[PDB]
Write an enzyme that holds these catalytic residues in place. Sequence first.
Site, PDB file in Angstrom:
ATOM      1  N   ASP A 303      -9.683   1.092  -6.038  1.00  0.00           N
ATOM      2  CA  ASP A 303      -8.715   0.226  -6.691  1.00  0.00           C
ATOM      3  C   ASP A 303      -8.286   0.791  -8.047  1.00  0.00           C
ATOM      4  O   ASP A 303      -8.928   1.685  -8.625  1.00  0.00           O
ATOM      5  CB  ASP A 303      -9.311  -1.173  -6.884  1.00  0.00           C
ATOM      6  CG  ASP A 303      -8.299  -2.293  -6.628  1.00  0.00           C
ATOM      7  OD1 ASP A 303      -7.073  -2.060  -6.795  1.00  0.00           O
ATOM      8  OD2 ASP A 303      -8.744  -3.410  -6.267  1.00  0.00           O
ATOM      9  N   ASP A 357      -1.233  -8.287  -4.652  1.00  0.00           N
ATOM     10  CA  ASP A 357      -2.270  -9.110  -4.039  1.00  0.00           C
ATOM     11  C   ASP A 357      -1.696 -10.401  -3.470  1.00  0.00           C
ATOM     12  O   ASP A 357      -0.833 -11.041  -4.085  1.00  0.00           O
ATOM     13  CB  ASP A 357      -3.337  -9.485  -5.064  1.00  0.00           C
ATOM     14  CG  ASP A 357      -4.175  -8.325  -5.492  1.00  0.00           C
ATOM     15  OD1 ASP A 357      -3.920  -7.168  -5.074  1.00  0.00           O
ATOM     16  OD2 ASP A 357      -5.098  -8.587  -6.284  1.00  0.00           O
TER      17      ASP A 357
END
Lengths: 478, 460, 479, 479
Positions: A303, A357
């Site tokens: 990430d 997201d």
Amino acid sequence: SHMRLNLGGAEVFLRAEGLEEAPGGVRLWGREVRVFPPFPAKGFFRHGWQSWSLAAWVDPAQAPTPLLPEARRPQADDPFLLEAGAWWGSGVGALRGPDGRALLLGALDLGARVLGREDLLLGRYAGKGGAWFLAYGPEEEVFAAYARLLPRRLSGRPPRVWCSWYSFYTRIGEDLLLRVLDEVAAFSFEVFQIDDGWQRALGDWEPNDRFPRGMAFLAERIRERGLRAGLWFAPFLVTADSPLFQKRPDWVLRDGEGRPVRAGFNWGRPLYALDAGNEEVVEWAADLVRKALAWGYDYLKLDFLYAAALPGAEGEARYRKAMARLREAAGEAYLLFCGAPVLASLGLADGLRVGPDVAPYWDNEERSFWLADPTGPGLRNALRSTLHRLWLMENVHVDPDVVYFRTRFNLLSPEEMRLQEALAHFTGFKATSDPPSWLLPEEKGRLEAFLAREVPVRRLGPYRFRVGEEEVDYAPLL
Amino acid sequence: GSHMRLNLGGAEVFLRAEGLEEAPGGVRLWGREVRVFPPFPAKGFFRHGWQSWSLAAWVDPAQAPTPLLPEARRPQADDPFLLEAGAWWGSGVGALRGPDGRALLLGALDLGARVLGREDLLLGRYAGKGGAWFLAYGPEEEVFAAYARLLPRRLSGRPPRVWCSWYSFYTRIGEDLLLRVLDEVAAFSFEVFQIDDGWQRALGDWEPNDRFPRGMAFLAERIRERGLRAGLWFAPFLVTADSPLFQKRPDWVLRDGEGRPVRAGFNWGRPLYALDAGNEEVVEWAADLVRKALAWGYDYLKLDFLYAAALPGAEGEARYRKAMARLREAAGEAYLLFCGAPVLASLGLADGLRVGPDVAPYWDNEERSFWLADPTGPGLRNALRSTLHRLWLMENVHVDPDVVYFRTRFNLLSPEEMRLQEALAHFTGFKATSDPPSWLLPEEKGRLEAFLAREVPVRR
Amino acid sequence: GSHMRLNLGGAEVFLRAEGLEEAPGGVRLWGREVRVFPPFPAKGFFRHGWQSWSLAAWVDPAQAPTPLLPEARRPQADDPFLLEAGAWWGSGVGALRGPDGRALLLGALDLGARVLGREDLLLGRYAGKGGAWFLAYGPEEEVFAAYARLLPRRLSGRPPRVWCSWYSFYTRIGEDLLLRVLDEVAAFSFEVFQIDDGWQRALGDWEPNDRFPRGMAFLAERIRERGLRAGLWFAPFLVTADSPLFQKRPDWVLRDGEGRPVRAGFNWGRPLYALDAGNEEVVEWAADLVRKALAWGYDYLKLDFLYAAALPGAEGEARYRKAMARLREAAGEAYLLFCGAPVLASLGLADGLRVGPDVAPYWDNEERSFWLADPTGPGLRNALRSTLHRLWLMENVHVDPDVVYFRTRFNLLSPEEMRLQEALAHFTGFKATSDPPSWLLPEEKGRLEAFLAREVPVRRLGPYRFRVGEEEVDYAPLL
Amino acid sequence: GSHMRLNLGGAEVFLRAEGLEEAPGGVRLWGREVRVFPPFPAKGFFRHGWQSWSLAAWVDPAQAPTPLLPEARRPQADDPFLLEAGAWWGSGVGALRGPDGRALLLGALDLGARVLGREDLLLGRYAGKGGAWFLAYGPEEEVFAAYARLLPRRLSGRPPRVWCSWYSFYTRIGEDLLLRVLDEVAAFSFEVFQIDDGWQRALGDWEPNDRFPRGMAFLAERIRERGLRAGLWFAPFLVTADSPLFQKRPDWVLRDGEGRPVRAGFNWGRPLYALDAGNEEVVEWAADLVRKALAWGYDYLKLDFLYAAALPGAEGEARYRKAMARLREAAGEAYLLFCGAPVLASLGLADGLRVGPDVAPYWDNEERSFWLADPTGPGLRNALRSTLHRLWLMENVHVDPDVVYFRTRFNLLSPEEMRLQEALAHFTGFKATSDPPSWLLPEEKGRLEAFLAREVPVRRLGPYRFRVGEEEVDYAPLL
């Protein structure tokens, strides 16, 4: 430099240092190239830099709106794209004819941007020049033709993943996850992925006090259930309270005056980056990969990868070299790239997040509109960028992010939830975070049928899909 | 710049430099820009100003530096860059103070460097192309002493004892007045009787004005007929718009990229300008002024406002050192005292170097030190502060703390403040005063002569 | 008002006012606002500052005023309004200057007035209730002498001769140091030994600090035992954030429309605040300071920073006068020297009045006078410039030009500079010094005694020319 | 005006007011503007916002208030003055907090006042004509209780138990859907079935839209056939530019000095405007809305966005009060729930009063609360914080904390967060939910019916500590 050519049965004028034929259009050469559309351009395809960045068709006549707050710009896009008063994209851009054909200009090398005007497509490499692809034709055809010229790494079918992030967020512990593991192992998952919340700190990639028996113990319990173990890292991210920040100030990425480059604002604190141009940092990050493999994890979610490519297009060369070493240290382990430069990751990533997201709600209107930030979590933001990056499916596993099945602890409506589920079928990337004990009986059955059946999925237009025999239209959300 | 790790003064220190090697007292780095990370949380930053009058002191780098006013005076106060930046930059050398009072020091070994200090970093950067550095971690005094040992030296016996006209008569001097004072001063153990600013016609017209009708060779001969050496004051690279030279040789004025004269500050009630010290004709003309003064009979020269030969700052030090090197050659063995001068870039050329702002017959002008935030203006406290933080240069040059006051007439200083400046002059060995003996009380005459006396060393 | 036509100095003068009436030397006008038009092109405006330290001088009304810096010091420099304005405003009185040296004067006969000067106009404006005005045209000295005759008067005989502690020791005073100086000072022909700033614990804590262990009544008794009157210094309406009184009586602090304390300047390294002189309880506390000092044995009082009682300027003059009227009654026949004080609104209450900036042991601090553009800071040139333009108040009060230096030790002034100040003491008759006799050379001791002991006749030959005894003293070079 | 000395709570208190008399619990002051000086270093200011959704909390007076964004929402967040100003002002009442956890309280007894809090001062200012004040120093709870006793009260038995359609369906309601929900809801011990925003054609067009085809009297009749009272929502003084009333009666719109419509905020994606509550024809049209709802069968009315009748702030409270008194008259004994409403100016007219921001199915929108600095937006944390600081009104009005959630479906709140809201519903006795019974799990149905059917005893132990039943509930972490 000045050139005329026949492209898609149209006459196209351009400026470039070189030109040669290529499948589906032409290859251009030039540090900066300019292409003039043979039409009044109605739309520009604005392709954001990283996973969370905005990818969409925009009206080039209107001015871009500044993203706020300024502290979040480094984690939303290429900083250059957000400071500029014109419409710039990363890697590739396109102009849209009155007839829904696209004039596409796309770099074949690292570190390029594309500027869109209603009268011009301008491609500019940040560092040294390179090749370009130009094509005029049906929208899907030319994005397919461009993707074919980019690297591919297609590792079978995407695994089916249970992920701890979108239910428990950082509030995870070894005890809670063993309980959930027993729930989850009754379902046709292939990977049980522990997300952010296990580590002591950014840069301190060892288990915290809520994981007292450690991470290899956890991976072993996961494997005794027939599952692969997955683990989350943000390898090049650091905060000022990180012990790595204080123990190795020479690893922090710094500007010309030695100040740390700002990497955004998250978990309530300013973010900083480890210097991916530093050989000692890169092998420390490669060792993180080797450590997770020794622990028994063979699925890794990497990430906040933009931090290795700061400050934008100019950092993609460093990014590529550092990701290549992580790719080497992972061997055949599955690497899911998140928060990551989209085009510069192809060929290294097995899976790639292509949108903001998801979140247990359609849209936070304060963030999306008043702060003008479409990169924040939310199903609408997720869907919109994802829809504009499905053309990458022959280059990588396209991750649309997890699917929700629960109605508890969730604001999404069933029709909104099915929109996300459709894209998981279309991409084949199937993940959820729903703990089975938050699900109602009917929802348990939908989760297991979602995991166990391969539903055929057909694209009919840009925003229309038939999955099964149901028709799914995405045009309203835009 | 390679990433390097090393053990320095018993601590691990990470740094970024093109080269590293051993050096007496520490290590030597190479690189246009080098970066050193402190192995401690830094309590303070040693901020070393550019020229004689600039601030030299330990500062808290957490608090931002206060702009210096007026803007028109910045070019005569420091490297202009150091006064425009919103960070703490120093000239040539910087240091960070550890919680045990040891210092981490980064000092340049070549011309044209600045040092950025923060609580977390020492960044050295050469304005021109790269060069060597000295890096040391240890006791504050040891570490500065070790740095000075790697810099040029010119230690010319003991410094002469000087009587100077500036800090009593300022510009209001004349031949008849100085002959009267000379006969009084000659009763004391001085070596030099030095005429300061006020003899000349204009900046750039370095010929006697009408208060010196018989001229400067006459005055030097009268000084030497008393057993004293004759001293003279110049500001060779300074000029004003009403100077004849400004009108006759406009090709000599230092100009910027658009042909505008570079501003050299504000003094004597008018704006200042610089002669171009990169112009070979200007340097020969300045060297002729040194020869003319030796031919008149002066063999002690106060060369002042020398920062003008080095504008715009670090980038001008290479031109400055070459021009001073020519003046050093033309002075032969005459004693040269450098004033208003780039400190480190003067080393090895100057016999004496002013290291602080002018003293003044008062402790502090608060309107200039505080409200205008200018610590380079005259005053005993400004003088002491910078002087005290440059004593480590005493093995490279005679450190001039400026004159010592003994009078109480025409002076606002207290006796206690006065003895502070006296003590500093004993320590450096550079003894000078401007007090006319006819202004002194008998007690003060004895104090002055007792002070000119060679030291009787005490140590316990 | 009404448009009116006048013959005034052999000239026809046009004016706008409500009323007109003759008056000795000119005319009397009425109106909250009055407008007088010069019958000539005007070369100079007489700009009269508000308080003791303020600039009083002739200026060119064509050029714009220079902002005084820093902003924090404007409340203690002048009426804040005169310092924030783009035009040329003066306090109480203004004048325009004809080519022949003759002056058209417009002066308030009441409290709270300002006067605006342009090349073509004198504009008088009262801040509160309207009032009377004096208007005159004639030679400069005649016209100002006639205005002063209509102001209040208080002439307490002849000005005393004062040794003052401020201009040698400043705040570094102590009981024993002052007893030694008292010994030396008592040999000279002084009449008052005055203790200045440095004896108190704090502003608002007017009680002796550690350096005066036997207290102030003791010091005053030793002073009177040497044939001298005892003098003491106060800043009665001034207070700092550190002052206990600021903390105990927050209801005593002068506040603005939103309840924030009004700023009264910057001194002793800290921001200054004012006590509210419209609060009867504060006035009675300040009168208790006067009463306490008389009870201690002091009958000469230097009351300083009095502008604080009249903030924010002209508007505060009615409050200021009523508070000072009470301190005048509390002081009885004691001698009150007003300092830092609204000049015109003090007339009839002060026995002595400072009319210029503090002298200093130096000619001029150029950083404050030029770079900060503050002509109200300490310095002999600044002191002289304003004092020279207020000598016409000798009709109304003892005009204090501040002390005279004779020492050359601990002093930067030149002997020719020091004699300019000494002449103004002879002219006003107000004779004071701070020179400790032990700092004076024998020659300087002899000059000080002859200064105190003789009355040297001074005559004014012009605005900047005096004849002191037999010598012409010319001041005009200093402008 | 006059300076006064006071013995309040055994402490000495200096103040400035035009009058002073004794009062139960402290003193009554008179004055258009009054000033009170704390006998301590004040550590906190109680900043009381204007209306229901406004911030009520203790703040640090030392640090500066943060601008609320976007500017288009300021009229629906607070009194615009309190948002525009660079100091800490509150509405009606303010208080200063000592080191010993006692409050110095200054509260208006009349319409149209604000209070300014500084570390050193409490300043009360009436916007219009002067009026009375109440001053008290003592334990925090006693002085707020002492002040509330001096204000009007309308306490109508116990608050009814309400099912409300807003916090589940929002505007997406219809006649058919609500008949279905009515059938499930009627199994529970509710007293009122309340139809919220979504039934009307537009703001200003208070008639059923196309999704209510049989009309609103039909609906109330079906509600009463279940033994329930019918409740209905209006925003009577609100209008949008697309409202037909905006175009048919441009003369009803509240307009500024240049005839432009006063902006009343931004909501439902469009700018809001106000109807002029000083216009007698508007007030009778709004009173007729109440009469119409009564004739339809509704005897419980949610009157929302009421700040619009009081724009632009304290100055509009006199108009607001007259207009609300007419609606109070037209409602008779119907139950009037005031939402979005000026809190202190509604007392005595309202049966129930919302005292906090809307609850929402989440704890906090950090983008709105922090980055936009708007604590008036929907959210349980925003709701709780202001509600906690307005419980002291419980003896003047029914204090509505807003609805309680029991569902976990279509809700992001955790069970511990949901219990905090449930506790305040027990403490105030105001019990409402929006949860459709078919969204509830079996165990959640039982908690809802036990919530409605049992009166749980509840004890306040301190400012943020409650004992409800036998649980201890502490709210101190959220602030």
